[PDB]
């Protein structure tokens, strides 16, 4: 089983600097070429570069966009991928998935890594607040409003209740992050039983639960 | 080299096939190897892209045989038979002939019946109306198509200062979307005025679904 995992996202000025790592395993590291492609949210892939394999000398390329301003390395002892990135902007906004690529035959990236979210942006963290949205069958909802940067991850009873669920994409207005999610239920199990929305925001050491009450 | 996907999206019913375009600005055909340096790849909302494809039409491992990839120079395409709720996605055409690039993607969506969104309206918690602002919600849940027109109206007049909607994907268990209206006011103008509706005017009826609340009545 290959492995690929990314580490190193968060929120970062622009104009600074960052570290990706891409940590590997299940296959023979120094086979491969690897590469880095980044996607903002909501919009396509875009490929940034590569570092070739053992046989072509390690040597890199980059696409036209980070030319010069991103750096790929390798630590083969680690089985360990990194991108070092300056001179940060907004529109590098993006999570960083790394792919493990070419092996001098094969033409793909069969491997992918789950991605690191980076933020650019001069927005400070800001924790949410949770709000409840109280009222066949029975929609009741959270509010979570006033948070930066994303992500945050709503889930209803811990994640025992996931039918039923939309969790909507967050908005961002005067950088603050606001989503609701509703969940549908039966009557006849609300408001006989309990319902709780946990919120979490990593960015902010945030843990919330808030009871629906009728 | 320039990568370009054509259409952005489209919609194809359950059990039907769908056929996706990906154009190169010059030739990925390495004549050494007689090989369109060309990949396909699937992704899934919220979720890490996967190769479907190589070298034009060829299927990646444990792709099953109802996905197919042609094509040749610059001119390829995918084709999905047998289009079920698993595929909902972009996919991506990548070319890897002189370093690497991505198309733009094409959204594949489910085509499904027609349906009239479920209509709910929320005052402002008590907890937030403690707080320095009011936020009023509406969500318009498992409709379809996806495009749908709400209003908010506030002691009878329409409202647009401050409403801000958000769309979920296409959803995986029946193939409808769903949208949220937010309207956030401050707590003094919330308390300003009393009548608050939500109007979803969707395709599905020539009458919009209102639900309502008097801030007075809660
Ligand atoms: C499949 O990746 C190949 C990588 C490499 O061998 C390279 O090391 O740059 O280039 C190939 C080009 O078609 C140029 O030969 C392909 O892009």
């Known amino acids: 089983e290959v492995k690929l995992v990314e580490s190193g996202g968060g929120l970062v000025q622009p104009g600074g600097s960052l570290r990706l790592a891409c940590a590997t395993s299940?296959?023979?590291?120094?086979?491969?070429?690897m590469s880095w492609v980044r996607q903002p949210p909501g919009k396509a892939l875009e490929w940034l570069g590569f570092?070739?394999?053992?046989?072509?000398?390690?040597?890199?390329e980059y696409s036209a966009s980070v030319k010069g301003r991103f750096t790929i390395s390798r630590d083969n002892s680690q089985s360990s991928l990194y991108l070092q990135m300056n001179t940060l902007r907004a529109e590098d906004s993006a999570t960083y998935y790394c792919?493990?690529?070419?092996?001098?035959?094969?033409?793909?990236?069969?491997?992918w890594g789950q991605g690191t979210l980076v933020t650019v942006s001069a927005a400070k963290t800001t924790p949410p607040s949770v709000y409840p949205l109280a009222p066949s069958m029975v929609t009741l909802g959270c509010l979570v409003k006033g948070y930066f940067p994303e992500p945050v991850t709503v889930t209803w009873n811990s994640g025992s209740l996931s039918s039923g669920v939309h969790t909507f994409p967050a908005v961002l207005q005067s950088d603050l992050y606001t989503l609701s999610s509703s969940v549908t239920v039966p009557s006849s199990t609300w408001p006989s039983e309990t319902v709780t929305c946990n919120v979490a925001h990593p960015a902010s050491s945030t843990k919330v639960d808030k009871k629906i009450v009728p | 080299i320039v990568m370009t996907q054509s259409p952005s999206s489209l919609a194809v019913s359950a059990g039907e096939k769908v056929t996706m375009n990906c154009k190169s600005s010059?030739?990925?055909?390495?004549?050494?190897?007689?090989?369109?340096?060309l990949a396909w790849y699937q992704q899934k909302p919220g979720q890490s892209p996967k190769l479907l494809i190589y070298?034009?039409?060829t299927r990646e491992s444990g792709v099953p045989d109802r996905f197919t990839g042609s094509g040749s120079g610059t001119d390829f395409a995918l084709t999905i038979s047998s289009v079920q709720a698993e595929d909902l996605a972009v996919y991506y055409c990548?070319?890897?002939?002189?370093?690497?690039?991505f198309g733009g993607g094409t959204k594949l969506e489910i085509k499904r019946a027609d349906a009239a969104p479920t209509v709910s309206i929320f005052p402002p918690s008590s907890e937030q109306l403690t707080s320095g602002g009011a936020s009023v919600v509406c969500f318009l849940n498992n409709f379809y198509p996806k495009d749908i027109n709400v209003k908010w109206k506030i002691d009878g007049s329409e409202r647009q200062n401050g409403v801000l909607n958000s769309w979920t994907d296409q959803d995986s268990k029946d193939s409808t979307y769903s949208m949220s209206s937010t309207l956030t006011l401050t707590k003094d103008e919330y308390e300003r005025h009393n009548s608050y509706t939500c109007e979803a005017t969707h395709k599905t009826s020539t009458s919009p679904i209102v639900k309502s609340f008097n801030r007075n009545e809660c």
């Open positions: 299940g296959f023979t590291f120094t086979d491969y070429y």
């Open positions: 010059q030739s990925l055909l390495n004549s050494r190897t007689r090989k369109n340096y």
């Open positions: 990548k070319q890897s002939y002189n370093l690497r690039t």
């Open positions: 070298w034009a039409s």
């Open positions: 570092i070739r394999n053992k046989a072509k000398g390690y040597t890199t």
């Open positions: 792919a493990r690529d070419h092996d001098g035959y094969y033409e793909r990236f069969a491997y």
